[PDB]
């Protein structure tokens, strides 16, 4: 009954809300999605059944999606072009602001290599790859600020920023390795591991308000709560794997993971009470207050405004 | 403002202490400044008018004194009231308990200062309202009695009301509270 | 053209046609061409319909088991229902973007007349087999098929009462006999209830004709209302008499007058069939339909009409013949979705193909870029032949990103199907290696358990060892585990890891021991050998002995059978190694004969 | 008291799959004979390892051939406390 | 919905063959002016051309690509009795030049992969040489392993898609030769274990007529086998195995299927990834699809004119 579900005829692979003043009692209203497994992918932005705004065709595959500002939108492409997209509001247009094509391409070879996954800290974007490479840009310059090459021989899958200067990176060998952007050398400070285990860890996610708390996802659906100080909690949850790990913005008592059996399930601190929201496979979500949305492979947006109802 | 509001607000709520008392002593640190920010402030009718001034070349709509700004995230239901009454729900319990608490007199001065803030909210309310009015803004406004009566998301009812009353049991303990609830 | 002959490539779903040579050795052109043969599928509503399906199938398979009897009849019911909305918002979608371009407004009027003949014959089939009605409860529901499809008699009354005084227009009437041939007496009393105050007489006589309409007989035991409606029509058969032209006309109808009948038959052939009916034969024998339909068709289409295949079909139906339904359709939809659903429902229902036009249907969602899953859903139910074609599609994918190659190797292990699965990860493996990218190759490598490919990597990177001097990604070597036991090689690096490791944080002992643990098992290639030798020498030349006189014999025993193989700078050191080497070891010996 | 010893450590095997093994051996040979036959349990674990094809790395023989071993000391082990478990109730 | 695509061909003479690869992405095109292209598709159906180099001074015939489990493995057979093996370096580049052959290597088969990498190569001395590389990373060394005399021009070879372990690898081999009487064209050879060698099993004595290509159908969990044979007309067979040793299971055979309809020589047989509709050419300029119904009953499904367009 929450759940309106209009079905559109792409794929959707991310799901982002348009960051809300907080000095404001504004309630969010629109959302941005982007489409994957199709010839002509796309970027599209919606507003709360959901009616579209405005959608650009992108280039490649869209991988990952961050808003960056109300006005911008920074995507990653599946050929490692990493895009800045500007809204302009009053005439409701998507244009092109700034691009660097080679971000990501694998080492000698020719042929490109996709670029995982995206983390912004304005005015500071670091996008990790499939090839090792962690390359840092910023919002005005045309070139690359730094490049740790041969950072991880393994294709890299999440990064999220740790305090400040400093990257979490997870693995396709199962290791969380924390990186620093001031020291000049290209080696990680630690690297975190389950011993005995390689299963691959496909999200990383970092609590809102205490820093040492980082929730991570695996191929075995299971999630494990680490402290970067000191796994403190492995908890089993679903019978495949974890795509996408979302701690609530407002009331991080709240998590939100979705897999690709289709279950969005909720956890609650507020004993841990888990519920399916959800009666293919749902690649994204992102919540804030009490709207969220959730994208699903059956071509298929879900969006509630009364989560907590 | 923005800084003290937000950042404290949230590290009231969920963020780890060493020490169980330290919880409280950040929120009434945090609400006494809120008080003394609303207390002076009287409305004006140029409060209700805003200039925008430009910054970087991006209109943003100027910084309106701190009480306005304390006043219209208070008639609505913003976090700020929710966690309000959410600080008298739950200063009501650990005060039924009758225990030897961790900072309970730093709770009772947190909660005056709460009760406080309503008390002096109802007067200044008619008067923003009626000024507000005439000021042809798009900003919005419930008074408080109707938002006093409004849905509690954790209990699912309008018992503000009722956790209010519970104040006057312990007449005889805080008395100050007591006054202030009758009000 | 011209005589060339014109080859052909298979692809994987798609046909490539090319013009080879004259077949003679060699009009003069050139050969710029280079053909693709292969849009139902392509439509995004139809995905979006094809979807919904998807989800209403799984939702019916699984409540087979639980539900039972009329419950299930009725669940059955409300599933058609289920697929004829769908098919109307679907519709109703396209029609919206026939309004925006109308310069592809035709393509998209027909298919919505396609979209609609499907669903009205799908209504009518439905209700006819599905909910199988008894006599009268049928034609109640023929009534309202009818009224829902064809809704001309709406569109003139809207007219009519939109004119300024709806009385004297020329659709008045019409709208009032339409209304009453639908079997709506409400709608055209609230009419004639218009007219009635123009004159006196007409008054008089709107006020007869409105009481007869509301006294008429009308099903909501069945005996009961076949005697009220008789006596009705004899009333009105009274009226007329004594009367004796549109109201004239209006009972000439109440009566069911087979003239008055055909003279306004201008709506379809079977608007006319129900019409008929209704006035004619109030109580409705299932069985004899298919005759009364098609002396209505001859009736109506009594010039030079051709029965349309649509009419065709209706016959069928109205014959009870599912079969024939089935042939004439498969000739004009090259769509499969109606005939499987229809199919699929008619199968529930016990009536009875299902398993191959399904397997058809799916093997199409195979050749499509995104509709894949939904073929691996459909290819599932199918019992005998559904897995070969599942295996074959399943490894025959693209497979690009880590993502989809992880999806598709999922789908895979939840049918057990492990001779797709060692494929796909040996693919994706060797792409990865050959792009340096060691770490990765490891990893797909120990899924498909492949003994083979673990010892080519472990390999190259005892090569690169041996030429920087360190080892590479020593994090990743040092946490294997049980997946070292895969293959020889693997279990030799991760134990030359173990050993630099210990004796680099003062283990030399346990190191030492592992060495010639190592050398004496032959796991080690040869060329190892040398090198674990020189490790082992200042190991003994260590003040503190590390290796018992025992184990230097071992490794005398190993020099001298390496010395042996290897005759079936360098040799200088290794000479004086050999010499230190003896010499230690004899004052080990010695210390212990004294020890 | 009961005694039951470790699981299954299974190098190229399935730990959850051996139980169905297990069962099979549950079978009673004729009453409350839980307990299949030595003969047939061992010939039966012999012939499954060579099924399973030591193609390009052989060395791991002997370590395969220990864990047969282990294993069979361990149905015998269940299958005697099972059987004191019995007697221990009938008394 | 059939759509035409005009690609520039880029060709300065007339195109021979054309192949695509095993994930429908990468094709080979031979010409006559001893030139092989290989076009690539981007993620817009637009093909680029990547790589063009000289192969031989012979007149090339047919190109096959390998499993990509093996890499980038390319094949090509000549007039001038060479088969050479191509691959990549990161340019094509040769690392064998198989040369056993006295006359025309006339068609050249990859094996199926359970097997190995097995290249297999037919030549008019009737005799099909069945190479095999020890190491996939070194592609220069080429070990022949069986040589199959089958006592008539060969003209083409296909392999038994069966991955059945029960089913013992299995090779067909055609005679183009116009021989007035001489019947049983068609060949059909099994590999005996026991005797590790190669071993006539079934000789379609109804082929009277020159054999210009045969396809073997994947096998689809069945117990019998379907083979096409192109002759003066399109002829489908179904090989039936017996019963069940020490020798060859001899086969029960029946032609279920004969179409004229061509009217003209049918030159190529090509079967779909699933192995339901089967293409044939001809000296018509046509080519005409053919599809079994649900009573086993083929028919044609579609023709095609010489300018392009389909025939309606």
């Given at each position: 009954?929450?759940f309106?579900?209009?079905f ?9 809300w348009r ?34 705004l ?19 939108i ?31 391409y ?30 840092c ?55 975190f ?11 990383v ?5 205490q820093?040492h708390?980082?929730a ?6 299971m ?8 796994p403190?909690?492995?908890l ?52 804030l207050?009490?709207?969220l ?16 109802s | ?8 607000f ?5 963020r780890?202490?060493?020490?169980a ?9 945090v609400?006494?400044?809120f ?33 306005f ?15 309000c009454?959410s ?66 998301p ?16 312990h ?7 007591a006054?202030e609830?009758?009000? | ?11 994987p ?11 003679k ?29 998807h989800?209403?199938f ?7 088991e ?16 289920n ?20 310069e ?24 006819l ?5 008894p ?21 003139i ?19 009032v006999?339409?209304?009453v ?7 055209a009393?609230?009419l ?33 209302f ?44 079977y ?15 299932p ?44 000739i ?23 398993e ?9 969602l ?13 290819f ?78 472990s ?10 001097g ?19 090689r ?74 042996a ?5 360098d040799?200088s ?18 210390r212990?004969?004294?020890? | 008291?009961?005694?039951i ?25 004729r ?26 790395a ?32 009938h008394? | 919905?059939?759509?035409?695509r ?14 695509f690869?095993f ?71 040769k ?46 060394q ?14 083409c ?16 081999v ?42 073997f ?31 060859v ?12 309809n ?24 046509t080519?005409?699809?053919w ?7 083929w028919?044609?499904?579609g ?10």
């Amino acid at each position: 009954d929450k759940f309106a579900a209009k079905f559109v005829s792409h794929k959707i692979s991310r799901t982002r809300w348009r960051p809300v003043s907080a000095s404001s009692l504004q309630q969010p209203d629109v959302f941005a999605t982007g489409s994957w497994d199709n010839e002509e992918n796309k970027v599209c932005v919606w507003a709360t059944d959901p009616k579209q705004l405005c959608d650009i065709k992108h280039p490649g595959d869209v991988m990952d999606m961050q808003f960056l500002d109300k006005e911008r939108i920074v995507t990653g492409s599946s050929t490692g072009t990493v895009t800045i997209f500007r809204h302009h509001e009053n005439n409701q247009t998507l244009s092109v602001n700034q691009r660097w094509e080679q971000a990501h391409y694998h080492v000698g070879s020719n042929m490109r290599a996709p670029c995982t996954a995206i983390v912004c800290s304005s005015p500071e974007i670091v996008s990790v790859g499939e090839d090792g490479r962690i390359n840092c840009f910023r919002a005005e310059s045309r070139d690359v600020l730094r490049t740790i090459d041969d950072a991880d021989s393994s294709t890299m899958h999440g990064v999220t920023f740790l305090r400040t200067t400093e990257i979490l990176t997870v693995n396709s060998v199962g290791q969380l390795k924390l990186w620093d952007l001031r020291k000049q050398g290209n080696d990680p400070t630690q690297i975190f591991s389950v011993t005995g285990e390689r299963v691959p860890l496909h999200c990383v996610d970092r609590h809102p308000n205490q820093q040492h708390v980082v929730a991570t996802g695996g191929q075995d659906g299971m999630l494990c709560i680490w402290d970067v100080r000191h796994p403190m909690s492995l908890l089993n949850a679903h019978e495949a794997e974890m795509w996408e790990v979302h701690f609530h913005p407002s009331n991080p008592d709240h998590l939100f993971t979705c897999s690709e059996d289709g279950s969005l399930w909720h956890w609650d601190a507020s004993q841990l009470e888990i519920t399916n929201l959800l009666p293919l496979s749902v690649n994204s979500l992102d919540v804030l207050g009490q709207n969220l949305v959730c994208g699903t492979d059956a071509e298929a947006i879900y969006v509630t405004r009364r989560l907590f109802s | 403002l923005q800084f003290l509001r937000d950042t404290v607000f949230l590290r009231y709520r969920t963020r780890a202490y060493r020490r169980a008392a330290e919880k409280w002593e950040v929120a009434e640190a945090v609400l006494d400044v809120f008080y003394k920010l609303l207390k002076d402030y009287e409305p004006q009718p140029e409060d209700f008018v805003d200039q925008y001034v430009e910054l970087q070349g991006e209109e943003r709509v100027a910084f309106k004194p701190p009480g306005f700004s304390l006043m219209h995230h208070l008639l609505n239901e913003s976090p700020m009231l929710e966690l309000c009454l959410s600080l008298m729900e739950e200063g009501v319990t650990q005060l039924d308990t009758y225990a030897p608490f961790p900072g309970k007199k730093h709770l009772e001065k947190a909660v005056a200062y709460c009760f406080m803030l309503l008390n002096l909210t109802l007067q200044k309310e008619n008067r923003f309202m009626d000024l507000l009015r005439e000021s042809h803004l798009s900003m919005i406004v419930t008074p408080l009695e109707q938002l006093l009566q409004g849905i509690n998301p954790r209990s699912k009812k309008a018992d503000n009301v009722v956790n209010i009353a519970r104040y006057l049991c312990h007449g005889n303990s805080n008395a100050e509270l007591a006054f202030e609830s009758a009000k | 053209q011209q005589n060339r002959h014109i080859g052909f490539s298979w692809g994987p779903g798609d046909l490539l046609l090319y013009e080879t040579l004259y077949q003679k050795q060699g009009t003069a052109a050139r050969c710029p061409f280079m053909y693709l043969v292969r849009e139902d599928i392509y439509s995004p509503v139809l995905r979006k319909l094809f979807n919904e399906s998807h989800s209403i199938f799984v939702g019916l398979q699984k409540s087979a088991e639980e539900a039972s009897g009329k419950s299930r009849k009725a669940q059955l019911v409300q599933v058609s229902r289920n697929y004829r909305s769908v098919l109307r918002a679907c519709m109703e979608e396209m029609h919206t973007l026939s309004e925006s371009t109308r310069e592809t407004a035709q393509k998209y009027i027909s298919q919505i007349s396609i979209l609609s003949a499907m669903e009205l014959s799908w209504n009518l089939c439905e209700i006819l087999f599905i909910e199988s009605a008894p006599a009268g409860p049928l034609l109640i529901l023929l009534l309202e098929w009818v009224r829902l499809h064809v809704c001309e008699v709406d569109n003139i009354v809207q007219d009519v009462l939109r004119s300024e005084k709806p009385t004297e227009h020329e659709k008045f009437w019409d709208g009032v006999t339409g209304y009453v041939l639908q079997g709506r007496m409400n709608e055209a009393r609230q009419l004639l209830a218009k007219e009635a105050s123009t004159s006196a007489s007409a008054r008089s006589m709107c006020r007869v004709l409105d009481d007869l309409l509301k006294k008429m007989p009308m099903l909501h035991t069945l005996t009961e209302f076949e005697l009220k409606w008789q006596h009705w029509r004899e009333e009105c058969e009274r009226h007329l008499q004594n009367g004796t032209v549109h109201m004239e006309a209006v009972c000439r109808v109440l009566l069911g007058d087979e003239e008055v009948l055909l003279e306004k038959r201008d709506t379809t052939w079977y608007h006319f069939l129900v019409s008929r009916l209704l006035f004619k034969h109030p109580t409705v024998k299932p069985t004899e339909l298919h005759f009364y339909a098609q002396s209505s068709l001859d009736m109506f289409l009594a010039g030079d009409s051709c029965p349309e295949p649509l009419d065709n079909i209706l016959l069928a139906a109205f014959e009870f013949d599912i079969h024939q339904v089935i042939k004439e359709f498969s000739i004009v939809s090259s769509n499969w979705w109606f005939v499987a659903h229809l199919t699929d429902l008619l199968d529930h229902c016990q009536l009875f193909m299902r398993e191959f036009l399904l397997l058809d249907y799916a093997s199409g969602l195979f050749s499509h870029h995104s509709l894949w899953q939904l073929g691996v859903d459909y290819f599932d139910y199918c019992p005998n032949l559904g897995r070969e074609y599942l295996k074959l599609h399943m490894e025959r994918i693209p497979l690009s990103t880590e993502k989809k190659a992880l999806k598709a190797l999922r789908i895979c292990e939840q049918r057990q199907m492990t001779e797709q699965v060692r494929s796909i990860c040996k693919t994706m493996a060797m792409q990865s290696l050959c792009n340096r990218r060691l770490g990765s190759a490891l990893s797909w490598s120990i899924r498909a358990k492949d003994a083979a490919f673990a010892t080519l990597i472990s390999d190259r990177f005892l090569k690169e060892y041996c030429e920087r001097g360190n080892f590479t990604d020593l994090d990743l070597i040092d946490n294997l585990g049980s997946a070292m036991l895969l293959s020889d090689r693997l279990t030799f690096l991760g134990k030359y890891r173990e050993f630099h490791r210990m004796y680099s944080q003062e283990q030399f002992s346990e190191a030492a021991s592992l060495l010639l643990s190592l050398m004496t098992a032959r796991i080690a290639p040869c060329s190892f050998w040398l090198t674990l030798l020189l490790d082992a020498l200042p190991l003994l030349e260590q003040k503190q002995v590390i290796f018992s006189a025992e184990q230097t014999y071992e490794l005398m025993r190993c020099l001298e059978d390496r010395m042996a193989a290897k005759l079936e700078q360098d040799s200088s050191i290794d000479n004086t190694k050999v010499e230190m080497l003896r010499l230690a070891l004899a004052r080990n010996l010695a210390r212990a004969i004294v020890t | 008291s009961n005694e039951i010893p470790e699981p299954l450590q299974l190098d190229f095997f399935d730990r959850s799959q051996i139980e169905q093994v297990i069962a099979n051996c549950e079978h009673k040979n004729r009453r409350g004979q839980t307990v299949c036959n030595v003969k047939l349990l061992h010939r039966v674990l012999v012939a499954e390892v060579n099924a399973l094809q030591g193609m390009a790395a052989i060395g791991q023989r002997p370590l395969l051939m220990e864990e047969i071993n282990t294993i069979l000391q361990y149905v015998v082990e269940r299958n005697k406390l099972l059987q004191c478990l019995h007697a221990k109730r009938h008394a | 919905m059939f759509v035409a695509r005009s690609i520039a061909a880029d060709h300065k003479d007339l195109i021979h063959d054309v192949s695509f690869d095993f994930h429908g992405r990468r094709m080979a095109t031979c010409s006559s002016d001893q030139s092989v292209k290989v076009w690539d598709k981007s993620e817009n159906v637009n093909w680029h051309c990547t790589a063009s180099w000289k192969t031989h001074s012979g007149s090339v015939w047919r190109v096959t690509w390998a499993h990509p489990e093996f890499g980038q493995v390319l094949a090509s057979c000549s007039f001038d009795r060479t088969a050479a093996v191509w691959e990549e370096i990161v340019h094509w580049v040769k690392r064998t030049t198989l040369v056993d052959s006295r006359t025309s290597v006339t068609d050249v088969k990859f094996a199926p992969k359970h097997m190995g990498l097995m290249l297999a190569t037919c030549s008019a001395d009737g005799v099909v040489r069945i190479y095999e590389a020890p190491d996939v990373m070194n592609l220069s060394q080429w070990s022949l392993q069986h040589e199959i005399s089958c006592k008539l021009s060969c003209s083409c070879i296909s392999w038994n898609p069966s991955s059945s372990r029960a089913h013992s690898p299995m090779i067909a081999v055609g005679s183009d030769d116009s021989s007035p009487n001489i019947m049983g064209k068609v060949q059909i050879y099994e590999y005996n274990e026991n005797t590790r060698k190669y071993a006539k099993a079934e000789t379609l004595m109804s082929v009277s007529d020159p054999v210009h290509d045969i396809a073997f159908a994947p096998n689809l969990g069945r117990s019998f086998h379907i083979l096409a044979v192109a002759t003066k007309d399109v002829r489908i067979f179904t090989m039936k195995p017996l019963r069940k040793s020490g020798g060859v299971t001899k086969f029960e055979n029946h032609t279920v299927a004969q179409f004229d309809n061509h009217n003209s020589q049918v030159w190529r047989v090509s079967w779909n990834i699933t192995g339901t509709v089967l293409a044939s050419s001809g000296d018509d300029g046509t080519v005409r699809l053919w599809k079994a119904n649900y009573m086993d009953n083929w028919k044609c499904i579609g023709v095609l004119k010489g300018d392009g367009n389909p025939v309606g």
